[PDB]
Structures are given as C-alpha cells and as structure tokens.
Coordinates of C-alpha atoms (C1' of nucleotides) in Angstrom, one line a residue:
Chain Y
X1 CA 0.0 0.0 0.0
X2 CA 0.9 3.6 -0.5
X3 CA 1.7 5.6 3.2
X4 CA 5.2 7.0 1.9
X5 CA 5.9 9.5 4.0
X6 CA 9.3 11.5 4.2
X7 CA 10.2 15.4 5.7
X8 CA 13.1 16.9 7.4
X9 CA 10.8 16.6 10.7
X10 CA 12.8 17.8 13.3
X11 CA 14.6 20.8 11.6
X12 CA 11.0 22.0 10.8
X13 CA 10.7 22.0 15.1
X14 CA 13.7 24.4 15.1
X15 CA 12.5 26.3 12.3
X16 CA 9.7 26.9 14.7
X17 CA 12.0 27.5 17.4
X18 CA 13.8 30.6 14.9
X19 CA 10.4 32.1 13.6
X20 CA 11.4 31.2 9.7
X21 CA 8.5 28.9 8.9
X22 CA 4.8 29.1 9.9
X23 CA 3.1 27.3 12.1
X24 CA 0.4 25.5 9.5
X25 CA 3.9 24.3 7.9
X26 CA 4.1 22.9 11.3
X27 CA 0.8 21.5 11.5
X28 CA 1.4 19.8 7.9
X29 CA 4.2 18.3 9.3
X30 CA 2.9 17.0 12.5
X31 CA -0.3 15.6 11.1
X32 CA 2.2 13.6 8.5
X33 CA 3.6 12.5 11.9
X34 CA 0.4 11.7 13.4
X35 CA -0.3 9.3 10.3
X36 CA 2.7 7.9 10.5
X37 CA 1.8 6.6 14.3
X38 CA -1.3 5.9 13.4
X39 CA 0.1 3.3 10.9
X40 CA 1.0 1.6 14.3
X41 CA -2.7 1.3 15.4
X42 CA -3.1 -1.9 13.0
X43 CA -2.8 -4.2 16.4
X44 CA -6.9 -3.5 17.6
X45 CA -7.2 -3.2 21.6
X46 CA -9.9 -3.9 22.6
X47 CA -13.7 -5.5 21.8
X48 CA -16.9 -5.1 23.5
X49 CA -20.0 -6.8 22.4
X50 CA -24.0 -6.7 24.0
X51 CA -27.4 -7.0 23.1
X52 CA -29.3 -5.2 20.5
X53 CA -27.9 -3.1 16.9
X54 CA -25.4 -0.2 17.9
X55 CA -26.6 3.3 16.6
X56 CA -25.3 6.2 18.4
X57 CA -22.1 6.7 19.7
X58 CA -20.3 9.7 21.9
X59 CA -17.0 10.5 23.6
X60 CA -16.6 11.9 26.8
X61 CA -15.1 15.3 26.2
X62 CA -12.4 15.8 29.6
X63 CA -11.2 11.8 29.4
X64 CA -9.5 9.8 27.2
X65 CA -10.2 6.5 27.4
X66 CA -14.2 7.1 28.6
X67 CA -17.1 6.6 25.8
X68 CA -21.1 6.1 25.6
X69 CA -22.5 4.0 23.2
X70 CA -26.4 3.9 22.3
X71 CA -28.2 0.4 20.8
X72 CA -31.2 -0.1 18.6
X73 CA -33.4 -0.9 21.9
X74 CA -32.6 1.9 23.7
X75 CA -29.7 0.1 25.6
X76 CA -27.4 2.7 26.8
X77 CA -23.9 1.7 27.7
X78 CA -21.1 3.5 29.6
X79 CA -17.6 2.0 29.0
X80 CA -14.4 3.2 30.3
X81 CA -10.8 1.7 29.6
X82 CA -8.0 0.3 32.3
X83 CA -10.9 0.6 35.1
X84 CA -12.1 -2.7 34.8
X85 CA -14.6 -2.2 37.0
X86 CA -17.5 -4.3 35.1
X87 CA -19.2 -1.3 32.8
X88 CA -22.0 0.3 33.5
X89 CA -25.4 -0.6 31.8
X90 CA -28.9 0.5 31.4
X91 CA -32.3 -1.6 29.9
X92 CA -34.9 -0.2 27.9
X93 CA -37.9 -1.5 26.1
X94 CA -35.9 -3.4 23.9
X95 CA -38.5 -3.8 20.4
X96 CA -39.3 0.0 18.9
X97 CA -37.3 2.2 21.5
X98 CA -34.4 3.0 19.3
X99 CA -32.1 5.7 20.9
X100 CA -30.9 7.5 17.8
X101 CA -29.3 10.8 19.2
X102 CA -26.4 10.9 22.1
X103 CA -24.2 13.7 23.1
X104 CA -22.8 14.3 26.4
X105 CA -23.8 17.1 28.8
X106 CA -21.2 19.4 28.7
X107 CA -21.9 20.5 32.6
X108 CA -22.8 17.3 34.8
X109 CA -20.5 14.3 32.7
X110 CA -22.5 11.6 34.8
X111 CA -26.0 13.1 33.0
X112 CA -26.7 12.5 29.2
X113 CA -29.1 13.7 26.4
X114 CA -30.9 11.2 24.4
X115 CA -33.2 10.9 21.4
X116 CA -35.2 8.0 20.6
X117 CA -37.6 6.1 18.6
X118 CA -40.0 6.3 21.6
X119 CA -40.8 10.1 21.2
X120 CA -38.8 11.5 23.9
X121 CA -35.9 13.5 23.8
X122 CA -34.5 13.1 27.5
X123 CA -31.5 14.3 29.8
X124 CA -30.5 11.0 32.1
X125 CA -28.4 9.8 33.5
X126 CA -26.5 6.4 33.7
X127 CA -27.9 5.2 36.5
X128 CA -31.4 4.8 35.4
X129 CA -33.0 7.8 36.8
X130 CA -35.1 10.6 33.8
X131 CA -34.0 13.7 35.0
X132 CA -36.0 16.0 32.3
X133 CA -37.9 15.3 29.4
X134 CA -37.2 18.0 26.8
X135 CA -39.8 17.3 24.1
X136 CA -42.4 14.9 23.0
X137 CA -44.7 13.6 20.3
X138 CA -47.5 12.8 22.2
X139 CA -48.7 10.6 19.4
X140 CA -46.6 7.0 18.4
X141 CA -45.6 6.6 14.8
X142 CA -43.7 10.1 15.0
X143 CA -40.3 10.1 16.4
X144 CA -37.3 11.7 16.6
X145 CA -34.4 11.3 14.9
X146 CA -31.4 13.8 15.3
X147 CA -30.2 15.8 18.5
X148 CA -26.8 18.1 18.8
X149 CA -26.0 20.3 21.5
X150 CA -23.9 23.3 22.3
X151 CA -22.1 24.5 25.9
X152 CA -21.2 28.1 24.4
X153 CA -24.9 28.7 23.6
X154 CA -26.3 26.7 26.1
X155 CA -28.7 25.2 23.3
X156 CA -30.5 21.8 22.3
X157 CA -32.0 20.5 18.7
X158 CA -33.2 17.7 17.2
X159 CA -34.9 16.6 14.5
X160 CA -38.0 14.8 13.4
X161 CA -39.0 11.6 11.0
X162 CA -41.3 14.2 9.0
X163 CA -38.9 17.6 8.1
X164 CA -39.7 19.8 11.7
X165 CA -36.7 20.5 13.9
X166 CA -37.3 21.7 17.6
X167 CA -34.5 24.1 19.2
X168 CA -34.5 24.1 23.6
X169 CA -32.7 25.8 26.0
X170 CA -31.0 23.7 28.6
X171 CA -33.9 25.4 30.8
X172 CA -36.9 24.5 28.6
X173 CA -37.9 27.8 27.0
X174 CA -39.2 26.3 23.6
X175 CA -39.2 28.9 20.6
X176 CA -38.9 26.9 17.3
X177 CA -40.8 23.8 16.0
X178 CA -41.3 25.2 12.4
X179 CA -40.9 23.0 9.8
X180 CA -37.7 22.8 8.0
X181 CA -37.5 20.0 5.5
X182 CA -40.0 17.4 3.8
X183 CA -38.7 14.1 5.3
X184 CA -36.8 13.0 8.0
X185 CA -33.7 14.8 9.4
X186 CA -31.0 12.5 9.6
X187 CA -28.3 14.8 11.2
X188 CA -27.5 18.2 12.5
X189 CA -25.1 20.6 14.1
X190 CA -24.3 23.9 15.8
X191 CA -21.0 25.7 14.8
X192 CA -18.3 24.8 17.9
X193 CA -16.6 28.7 17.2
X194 CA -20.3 30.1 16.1
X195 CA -23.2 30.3 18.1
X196 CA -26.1 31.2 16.3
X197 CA -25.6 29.7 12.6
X198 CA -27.0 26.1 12.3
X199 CA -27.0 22.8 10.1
X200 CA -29.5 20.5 9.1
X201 CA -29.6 17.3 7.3
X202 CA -32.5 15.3 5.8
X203 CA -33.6 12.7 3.5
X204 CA -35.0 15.8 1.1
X205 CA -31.5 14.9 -0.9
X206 CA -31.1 18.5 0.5
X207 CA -29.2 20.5 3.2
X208 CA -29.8 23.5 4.9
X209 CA -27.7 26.2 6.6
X210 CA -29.8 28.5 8.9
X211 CA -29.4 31.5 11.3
X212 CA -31.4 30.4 14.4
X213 CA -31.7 34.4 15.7
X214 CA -32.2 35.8 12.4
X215 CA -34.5 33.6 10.9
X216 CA -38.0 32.8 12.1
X217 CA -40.1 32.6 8.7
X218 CA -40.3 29.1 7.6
X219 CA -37.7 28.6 5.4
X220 CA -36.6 32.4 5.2
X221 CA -33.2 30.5 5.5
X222 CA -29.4 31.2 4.8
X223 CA -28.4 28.8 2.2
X224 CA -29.5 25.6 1.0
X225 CA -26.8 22.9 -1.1
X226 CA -28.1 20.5 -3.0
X227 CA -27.0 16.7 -3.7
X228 CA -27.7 14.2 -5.6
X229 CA -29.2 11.4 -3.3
X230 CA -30.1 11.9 0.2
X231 CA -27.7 12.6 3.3
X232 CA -26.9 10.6 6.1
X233 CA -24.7 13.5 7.3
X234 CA -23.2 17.4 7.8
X235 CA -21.0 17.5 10.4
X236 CA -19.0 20.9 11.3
X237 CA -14.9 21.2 11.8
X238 CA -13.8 22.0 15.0
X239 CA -12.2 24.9 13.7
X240 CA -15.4 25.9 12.0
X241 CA -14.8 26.7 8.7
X242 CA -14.9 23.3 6.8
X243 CA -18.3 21.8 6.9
X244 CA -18.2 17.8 5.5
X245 CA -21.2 16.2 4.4
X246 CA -21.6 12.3 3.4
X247 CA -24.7 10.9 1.3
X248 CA -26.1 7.8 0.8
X249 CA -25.4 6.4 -2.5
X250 CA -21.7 7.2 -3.4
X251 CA -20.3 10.8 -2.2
X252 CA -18.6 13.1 0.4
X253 CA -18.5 16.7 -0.2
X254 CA -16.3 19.2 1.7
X255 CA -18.0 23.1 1.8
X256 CA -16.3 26.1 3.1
X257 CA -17.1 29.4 4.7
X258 CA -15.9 30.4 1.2
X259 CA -19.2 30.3 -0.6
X260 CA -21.0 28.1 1.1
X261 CA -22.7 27.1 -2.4
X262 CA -20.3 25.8 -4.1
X263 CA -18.1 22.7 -3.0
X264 CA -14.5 22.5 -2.8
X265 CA -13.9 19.0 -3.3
X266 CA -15.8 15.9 -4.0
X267 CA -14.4 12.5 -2.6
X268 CA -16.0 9.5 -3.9
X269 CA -16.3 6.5 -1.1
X270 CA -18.5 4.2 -1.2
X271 CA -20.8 4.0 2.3
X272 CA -24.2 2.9 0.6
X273 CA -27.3 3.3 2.6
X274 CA -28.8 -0.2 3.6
X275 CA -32.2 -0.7 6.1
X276 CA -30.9 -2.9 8.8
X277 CA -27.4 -1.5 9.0
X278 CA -26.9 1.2 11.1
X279 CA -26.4 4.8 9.2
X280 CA -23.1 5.9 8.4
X281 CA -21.3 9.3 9.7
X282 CA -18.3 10.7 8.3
X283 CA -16.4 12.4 11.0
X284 CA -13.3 15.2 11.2
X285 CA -10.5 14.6 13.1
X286 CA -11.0 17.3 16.4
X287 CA -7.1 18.9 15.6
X288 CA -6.0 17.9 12.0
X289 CA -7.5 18.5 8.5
X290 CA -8.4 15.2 8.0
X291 CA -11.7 12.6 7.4
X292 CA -12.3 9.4 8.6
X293 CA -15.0 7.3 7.1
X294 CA -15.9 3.8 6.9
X295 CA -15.9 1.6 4.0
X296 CA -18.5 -0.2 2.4
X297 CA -17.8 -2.2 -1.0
X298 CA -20.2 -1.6 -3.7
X299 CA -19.7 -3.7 -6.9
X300 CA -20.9 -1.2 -8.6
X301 CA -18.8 1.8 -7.4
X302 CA -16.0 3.2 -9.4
X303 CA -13.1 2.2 -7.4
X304 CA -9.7 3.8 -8.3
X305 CA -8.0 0.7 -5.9
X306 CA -8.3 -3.0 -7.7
X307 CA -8.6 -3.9 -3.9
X308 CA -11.6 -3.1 -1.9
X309 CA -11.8 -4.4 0.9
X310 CA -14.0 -3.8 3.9
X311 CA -11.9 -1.2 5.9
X312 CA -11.6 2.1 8.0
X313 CA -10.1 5.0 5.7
X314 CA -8.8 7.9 6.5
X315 CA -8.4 11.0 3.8
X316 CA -6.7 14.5 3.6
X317 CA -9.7 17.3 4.1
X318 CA -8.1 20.5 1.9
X319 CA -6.9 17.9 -1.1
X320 CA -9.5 15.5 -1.6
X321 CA -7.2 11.8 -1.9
X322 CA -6.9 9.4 0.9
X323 CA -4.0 8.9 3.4
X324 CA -4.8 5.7 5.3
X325 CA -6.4 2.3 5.8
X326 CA -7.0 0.4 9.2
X327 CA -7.8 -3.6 8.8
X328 CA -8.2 -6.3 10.9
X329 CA -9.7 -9.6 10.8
X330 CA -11.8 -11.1 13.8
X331 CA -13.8 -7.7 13.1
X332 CA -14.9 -8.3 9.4
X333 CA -18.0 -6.3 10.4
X334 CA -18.7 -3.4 8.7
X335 CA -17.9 0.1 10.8
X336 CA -20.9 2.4 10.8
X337 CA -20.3 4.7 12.9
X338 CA -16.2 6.2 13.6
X339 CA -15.2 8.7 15.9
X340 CA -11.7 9.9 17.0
X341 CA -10.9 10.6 20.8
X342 CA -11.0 14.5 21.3
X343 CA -8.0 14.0 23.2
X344 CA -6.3 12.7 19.8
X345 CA -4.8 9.2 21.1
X346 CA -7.3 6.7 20.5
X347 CA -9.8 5.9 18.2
X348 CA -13.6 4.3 18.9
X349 CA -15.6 2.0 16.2
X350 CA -19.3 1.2 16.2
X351 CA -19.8 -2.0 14.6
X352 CA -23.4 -3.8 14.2
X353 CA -23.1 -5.5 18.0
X354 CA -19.8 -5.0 18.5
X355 CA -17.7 -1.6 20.5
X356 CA -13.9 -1.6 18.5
X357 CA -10.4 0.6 20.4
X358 CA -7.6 0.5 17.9
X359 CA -5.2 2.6 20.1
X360 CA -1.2 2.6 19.9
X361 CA 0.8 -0.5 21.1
X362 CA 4.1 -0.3 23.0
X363 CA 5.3 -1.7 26.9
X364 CA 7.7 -4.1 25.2
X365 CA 9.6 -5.3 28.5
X366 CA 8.1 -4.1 32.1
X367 CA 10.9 -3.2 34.9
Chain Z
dA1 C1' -46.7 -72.2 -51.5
dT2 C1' -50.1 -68.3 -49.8
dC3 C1' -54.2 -64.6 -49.7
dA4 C1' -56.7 -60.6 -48.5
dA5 C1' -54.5 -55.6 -49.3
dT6 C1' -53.2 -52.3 -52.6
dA7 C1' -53.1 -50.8 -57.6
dT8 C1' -55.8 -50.4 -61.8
dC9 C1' -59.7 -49.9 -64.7
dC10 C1' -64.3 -48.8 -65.6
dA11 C1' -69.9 -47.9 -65.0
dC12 C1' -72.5 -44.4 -62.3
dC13 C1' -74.3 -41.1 -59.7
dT14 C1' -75.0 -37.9 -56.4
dG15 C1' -72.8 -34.9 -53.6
dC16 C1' -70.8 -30.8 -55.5
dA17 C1' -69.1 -26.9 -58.3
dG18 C1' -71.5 -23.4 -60.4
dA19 C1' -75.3 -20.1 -62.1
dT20 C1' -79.8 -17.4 -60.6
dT21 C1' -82.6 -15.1 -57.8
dC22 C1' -84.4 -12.8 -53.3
dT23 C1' -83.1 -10.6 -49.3
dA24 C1' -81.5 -8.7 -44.3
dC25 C1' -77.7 -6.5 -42.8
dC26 C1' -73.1 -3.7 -43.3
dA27 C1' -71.1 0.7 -44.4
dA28 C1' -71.1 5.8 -44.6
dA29 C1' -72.6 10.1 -42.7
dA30 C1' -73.5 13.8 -38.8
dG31 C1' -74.2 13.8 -33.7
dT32 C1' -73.7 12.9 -29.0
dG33 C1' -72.5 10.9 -24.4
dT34 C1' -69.5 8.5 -22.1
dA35 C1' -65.5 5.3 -21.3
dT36 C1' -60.7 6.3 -21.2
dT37 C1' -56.2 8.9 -21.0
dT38 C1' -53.2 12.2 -19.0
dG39 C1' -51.0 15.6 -15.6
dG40 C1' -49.9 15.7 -11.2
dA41 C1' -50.1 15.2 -5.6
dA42 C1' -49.4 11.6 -2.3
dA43 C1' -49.2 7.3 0.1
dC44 C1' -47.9 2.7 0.8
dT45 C1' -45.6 -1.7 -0.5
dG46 C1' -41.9 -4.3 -1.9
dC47 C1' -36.3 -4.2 -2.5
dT48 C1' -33.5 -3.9 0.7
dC49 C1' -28.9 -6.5 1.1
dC50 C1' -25.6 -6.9 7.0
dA51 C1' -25.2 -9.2 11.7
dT52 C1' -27.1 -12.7 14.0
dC53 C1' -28.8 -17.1 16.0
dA54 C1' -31.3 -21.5 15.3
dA55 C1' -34.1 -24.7 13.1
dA56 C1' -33.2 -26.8 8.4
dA57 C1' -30.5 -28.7 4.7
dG58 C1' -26.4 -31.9 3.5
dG59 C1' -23.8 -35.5 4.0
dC60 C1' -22.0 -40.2 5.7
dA61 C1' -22.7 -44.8 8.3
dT62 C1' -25.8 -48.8 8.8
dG63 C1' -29.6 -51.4 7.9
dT64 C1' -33.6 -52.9 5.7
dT65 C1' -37.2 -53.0 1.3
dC66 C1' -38.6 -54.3 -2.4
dA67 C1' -38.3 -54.6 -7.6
dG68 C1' -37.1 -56.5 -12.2
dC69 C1' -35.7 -60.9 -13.1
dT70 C1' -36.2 -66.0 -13.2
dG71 C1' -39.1 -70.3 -14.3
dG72 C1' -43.0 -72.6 -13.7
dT73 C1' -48.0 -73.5 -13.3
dT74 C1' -52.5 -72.4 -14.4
dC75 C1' -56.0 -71.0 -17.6
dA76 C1' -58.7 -67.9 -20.3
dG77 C1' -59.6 -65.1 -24.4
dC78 C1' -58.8 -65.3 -29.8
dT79 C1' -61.0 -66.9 -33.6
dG80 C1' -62.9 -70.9 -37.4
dA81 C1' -66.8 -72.4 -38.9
dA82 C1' -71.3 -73.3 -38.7
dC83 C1' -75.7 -71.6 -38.0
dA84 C1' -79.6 -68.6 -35.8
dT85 C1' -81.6 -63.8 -35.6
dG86 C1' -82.5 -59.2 -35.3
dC87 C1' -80.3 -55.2 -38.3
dC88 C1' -80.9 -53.3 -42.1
dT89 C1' -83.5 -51.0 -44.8
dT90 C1' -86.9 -49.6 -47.0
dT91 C1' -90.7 -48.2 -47.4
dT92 C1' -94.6 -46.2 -46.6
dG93 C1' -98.8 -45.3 -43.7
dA94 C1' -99.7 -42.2 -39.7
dT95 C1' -99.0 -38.3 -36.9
dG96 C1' -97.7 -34.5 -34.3
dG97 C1' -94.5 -31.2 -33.1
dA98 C1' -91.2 -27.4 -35.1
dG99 C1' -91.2 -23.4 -36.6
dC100 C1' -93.5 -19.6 -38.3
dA101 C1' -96.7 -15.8 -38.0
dG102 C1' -100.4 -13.1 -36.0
dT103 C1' -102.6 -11.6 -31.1
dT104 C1' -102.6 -10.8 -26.2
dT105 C1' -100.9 -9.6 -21.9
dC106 C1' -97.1 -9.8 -19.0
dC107 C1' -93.4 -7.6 -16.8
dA108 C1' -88.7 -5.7 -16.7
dA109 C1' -85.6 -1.4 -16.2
dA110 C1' -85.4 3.8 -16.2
dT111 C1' -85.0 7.4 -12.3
dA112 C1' -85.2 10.2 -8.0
dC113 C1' -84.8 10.2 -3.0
dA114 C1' -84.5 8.9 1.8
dC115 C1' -83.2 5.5 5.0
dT116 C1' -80.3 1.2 6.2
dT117 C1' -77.5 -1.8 6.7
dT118 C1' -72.0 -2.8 6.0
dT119 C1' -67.4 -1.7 6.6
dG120 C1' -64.0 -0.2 8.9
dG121 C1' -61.9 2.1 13.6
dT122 C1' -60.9 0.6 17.6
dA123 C1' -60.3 -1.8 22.5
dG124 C1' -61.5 -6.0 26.0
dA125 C1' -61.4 -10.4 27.0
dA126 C1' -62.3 -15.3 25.0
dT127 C1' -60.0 -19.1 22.7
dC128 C1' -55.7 -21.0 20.8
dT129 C1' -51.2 -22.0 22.0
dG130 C1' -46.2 -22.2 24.1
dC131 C1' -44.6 -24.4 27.8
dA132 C1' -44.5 -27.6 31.5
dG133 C1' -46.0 -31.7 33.8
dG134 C1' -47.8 -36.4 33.8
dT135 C1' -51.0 -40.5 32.3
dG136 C1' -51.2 -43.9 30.0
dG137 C1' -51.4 -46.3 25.8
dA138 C1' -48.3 -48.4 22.8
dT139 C1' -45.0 -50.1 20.6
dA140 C1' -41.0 -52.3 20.1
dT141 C1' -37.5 -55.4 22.7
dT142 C1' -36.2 -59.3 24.8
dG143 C1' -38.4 -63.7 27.6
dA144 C1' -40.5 -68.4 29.2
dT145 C1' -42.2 -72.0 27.1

DNA sequence: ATCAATATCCACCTGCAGATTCTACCAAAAGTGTATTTGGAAACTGCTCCATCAAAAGGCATGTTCAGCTGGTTCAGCTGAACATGCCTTTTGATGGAGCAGTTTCCAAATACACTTTTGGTAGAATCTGCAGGTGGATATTGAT
C-alpha cells in the first residue's frame, strides 16, 4: 500500500523554534507525523460486544479512554478503559425504542441527552433515573431522529422523522418547532466557534444552513446545497470553517465558509445506505485537517484501488485523496459509525453488535 | 406355397361446383354521451442486502425394502366355422311437433330520494397455543415355554 511518508521533521521544530517557517507548515508536518503513528494502530485493543444493533455513539469530552454508546433498543452503555470495573449498563424496552441521538452534557459528565424512537428527547443519566424530558410527540408513529447540543450557547435540537426540527434551551424555554424539511432529518449541528448559525440534514437529498436568531419565517433560510441522493450527514470542523457532508449512494462533499454554495472538493467513497445496517457518519479529526469514514464495498462503485476491501479510511480534508487504511480480521463487520478521541490518542468504532479501540501499542519489557 | 391388401380400370351417380334469384344486414354520414387517457399530488408496498442465531438442509454410516428378473404353473380369451336372428332397410302409412306468424298480456328497467344496513376504527377479553407436567397407551425389545 501507499503511506510513503518523508520530511526533514525535526529541523521544521527548530525552524519553529527561529520564527522562519509558519506554524500551518508545522501542522502539515505534525499531522504527516500523526499518520505515520497511526500506521501503528493496526494491532486492535480492545472489543466489547452486547445486546441489540449499535446506533449512536459519543465521547466523553475531559477523558480519554471514557465513551457512551447507544443500541437499537434503547440500551445505553457506559464504557471506560483500564478501570475494569464491570461497565455500567442500562435496559430499555428493547423492540421500537431505538435511541438515535447521544451527546454528552457538557456540565454534569455523569448526565446524558438522548433521542429515541419512543418520542422522547430526555436528559438522564446512567444510573437509570429521567431527569427531564425535553420534548415529546404525544402521538406514536412520529419520532425523533437527530439531537446536537452546544455549551457556548447553552442550546438543544433535534430533529424529526417528518422535516420539523425543535430548538431548547438547557432550561426549557421552547421557541422553534417550524418546519424545515419534507422528510426526515438524519443529522444536525451547531458551529463549535459560532453560536447562532446552524446545520440540518435530511432525507429531502437537500441540506440546509440557517441562522437560528435571524430567521424565524419558515424557510426564510441562509443557504441551502443540493446533492444528488439523500444525506446521512453534515458535520461541522472544529475549527469551523470546513463543513463535511456524506450521502447515501456514493459521495462526500467538503463546503467552506468560502461560498458556502459551491463545493470545494468531492471525494468518492463508497458508504451505501442499507435498512438494517446502522447509518453511516463521516467524522473530522478534532485537531487535524483530516476525514475518517468507513468503507462499504459496492460492486458497482468506481473504485480507483483494484482492492476493496471492507476497511476504516482515513483522507486528507483541503486535497481530496486518501491517506490511510486500518484492517483487521476477527472484526470483518462493517464500521458504521467512527469517531476519533478529542484527546487525539485513541480511536472508537461502532460495529453492528460490536464496540472496536484500535489505540497505539508499546510496553515491550516491564521493569 | 399363400391370400386378403393395394393398384388399376371402368360404369354411375349424387354430392358438389356453379349459375340465378331474393333478401336482411353492413357501411357511410353527422351527432352525441360516455368510457378512457393524462397531468400531477401523495401514500404505501416491496427491494432492501448486513449481523445474527437456530431450526433446516447436507452429507455419511448402517440397515432394511422391495423390484425387475427368473421359471414354472395355471388357464382364459382369440378366432374358425357353422348356424340362428334381429339389423338393415326400406318403405310407406300415420301423426304430431317445429317453426313460423299473428294476437294478447305480462313484466322488466329507467330514475329520483330517503333510510339502512356494511365496513371499517378501535379496544376487551375469550379461545388457541407455548410451555411444562404427567398419564397412560403403545410399541418395540427381549423372555418363558
């Protein structure tokens, strides 16, 4: 396989240390670094199966090694690493209670937001007890689908089955529940440098940029892209200027502040949208320019390799070609869901029943 | 050697090709109503193709089942020839019912409107059924004679 890569690595350090070159020089340099390690991630760490499909899956921000993980029956899990102290679990109704939506709370880590296929978009926490329903249905056969949250703004949202997206404070204090889209919204985000500029995703084969202060008119929005299929996701950068999106058929688009419109690169993967497999999320990388997706063959995709196998890839974000491949057999599931530590050391997989950590090995000899 | 079957010829004769004449129904023309097609919202049903257990499909050992073959025994249908008998047929005397054609009276659908049951929508509990025991035939496996 490819991976090549060269520099004069250390001399750039010292260039840093002199003022001549500039720090994204740096950054280039490091991240090249950073792939190079990550080459050493092939040996995976650990596996963790349970009961019912995975669908949603979140980091905990402050610790490494900590993550929640969401199932198909509304089985919540709670997993952290060289603890070993049994994990800790949580039931639910097991048939049509899907949880579908998990971020953390940014202010109490041992609470949790939650949307599910039940109709309730809660804040609970790991040891069983609801602390506060945010929203409802009050009528079955119309769920939620998508939920995001911000600390800065203090905000919540999530999204419908139908094309209506409700917006919360962390109070309550409900002013929103217009309708956005036609279908259901299969992801969303707030802007982590931004407050008050938002992004929706649906099944419309459209996505939407809005201005949650400035706009109240139904549909009096900012800008709206187009695709070609539907979208399974638009996630923001951390840095906030690169917004990624991933559809359902073949496609990832990367769009910039820079004219939000038009798209600055295409990058052809193949992730095609199946019923009973769990949707896929392209991710960034919380402190590099790069993409991580997971693979899934299509034989009738255009692939530039002769070998496609089933496979975690990882591409450059500002050129549009990819950069790495982790493999392993014993896992020859397919990886719907794949999220990089925001610590930047470790890496977490959601495969259909089974939790993946790919992180570094060393310890050779122990004194 | 056969010995009716088919090939050949020839009288004949009656269905059959062909010509004539009456007739009911097919085509054209202007009009209309009414089935159908089309544009377009929307809803709902099948294609979907992993990730996974768990009954179901495959495959290999042993054992039994029976089937296409043998040969023999039994015996029952084929057919000659002779002779009876009702079929043919034909032939015509007898008749009544088929079909037509005129007369009478039934008796069905056209239409408007106002109920009236029928079909879902939707919950509650009654019956079927998984599961678990548990009786008792029962059905094969040895057992006394």
């Amino acid at each position: 396989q490819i991976l090549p890569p060269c520099r004069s690595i250390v001399r750039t350090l010292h260039q840093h240390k002199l003022g001549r070159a500039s720090w994204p020089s740096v950054q280039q340099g490091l991240q090249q670094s950073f792939l190079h390690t990550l080459d050493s991630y092939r040996i995976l760490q650990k596996a963790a199966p349970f009961d019912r499909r995975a669908t949603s899956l979140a980091w905990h921000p402050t610790h490494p090694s900590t993550v929640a993980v969401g199932s198909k029956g509304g089985d919540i899990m709670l997993w952290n690493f060289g603890i070993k102290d049994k994990p800790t679990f949580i039931k639910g109704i097991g048939a049509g209670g899907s949880i579908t939506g998990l971020k953390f709370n940014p202010l109490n880590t041992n609470q949790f937001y939650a949307s599910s296929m039940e109709g309730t978009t809660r804040l609970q926490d790991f040891k069983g007890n609801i602390l506060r329903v945010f929203a409802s249905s009050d009528t079955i056969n119309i769920w939620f689908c998508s939920l995001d949250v911000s600390a800065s703004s203090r905000m919540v949202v999530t999204g419908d089955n139908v094309g209506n997206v409700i917006l919360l404070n962390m109070d309550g204090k409900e002013l929103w529940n217009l309708r956005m889209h036609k279908k259901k919204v299969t992801h969303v985000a707030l802007n982590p440098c931004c407050d008050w500029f938002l992004a929706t995703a649906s099944v419309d084969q459209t996505v939407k940029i809005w201005d949650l202060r400035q706009v109240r008119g139904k549909a009096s929005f900012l800008y709206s892209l187009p695709h070609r299929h539907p979208v399974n996701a638009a996630c923001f950068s951390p840095d906030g200027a690169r917004l990624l999106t991933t559809d359902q058929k073949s496609e990832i688009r990367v769009y910039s502040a820079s004219q939000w419109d038009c798209p600055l690169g295409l990058i052809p993967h193949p992730h095609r949208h199946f019923q009973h497999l769990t949707p896929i999320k392209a991710a960034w990388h919380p402190r590099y320019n790069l993409i991580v997706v997971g693979r899934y063959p299509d034989p009738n995709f255009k692939s530039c390799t002769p070998y496609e196998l089933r496979t975690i890839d990882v591409f450059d974000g500002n050129s549009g070609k990819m950069m790495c491949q982790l493999y392993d057999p014993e896992s020859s599931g397919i990886s719907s869901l794949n999220e990089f530590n925001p610590m930047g050391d470790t890496l977490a997989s959601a495969m259909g029943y089974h939790i993946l950590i790919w992180s570094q090995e060393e310890a050779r000899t122990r004194k």
